[PDB]
Design a protein around this ligand. Structure first.
Ligand SMILES: [Zn+2]
Ligand SMILES: [Zn+2]
Ligand SMILES: [Zn+2]
Lengths: 39, 96
């Protein structure tokens, strides 16, 4: 496997959303940081 | 008419030549194929942004990397520096 989401852990994700800090997010929980504005 | 090619030329895992259908990441020199880029232990899919280890035979991820090293013979002590490690670069596109 690879790295896991900081919220779920979808290792089967098509792509990993990594920011400058290194907050690994699948995509589903990743948009939470963008839309909601939360971390 | 037009032929855009700037890759190595041939694989290092198989015998298939490289064409505009590799979709691999920037490795050392030899660029493998999308199906030729697999772990030697878990055989899982790699991730762009994470680290990996290149072996003379195949490639290894960063999940079982610490195990594979000790299995082969590349231990650097508990919590010590054993060897180098490369970070998975971005994948190549067929024109862009
Ligand atoms: Zn997630
Ligand atoms: Zn190949
Ligand atoms: Zn592996």
């Amino acid at each position: 496997e690879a790295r896991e989401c900081v919220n779920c852990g979808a290792t089967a994700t098509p792509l990993w959303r990594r920011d400058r800090t290194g907050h690994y997010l699948c995509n589903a929980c990743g948009l939470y940081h963008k839309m909601n504005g939360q971390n | 008419y037009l032929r855009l090619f700037g890759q190595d030329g041939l694989c290092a895992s198989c015998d298939k030549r490289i064409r505009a259908y590799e979709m691999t990441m920037r490795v050392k020199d030899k660029v493998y194929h999308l199906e030729c880029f697999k772990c030697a232990a878990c055989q899982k899919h790699f991730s762009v942004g994470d680290r990996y280890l290149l072996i003379n035979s195949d490639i290894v991820c960063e999940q079982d990397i610490y195990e594979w090293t000790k299995i082969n013979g590349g231990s650097g002590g508990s919590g010590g520096s054993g060897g180098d490690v490369m970070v998975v670069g971005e994948p190549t596109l067929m024109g862009g």
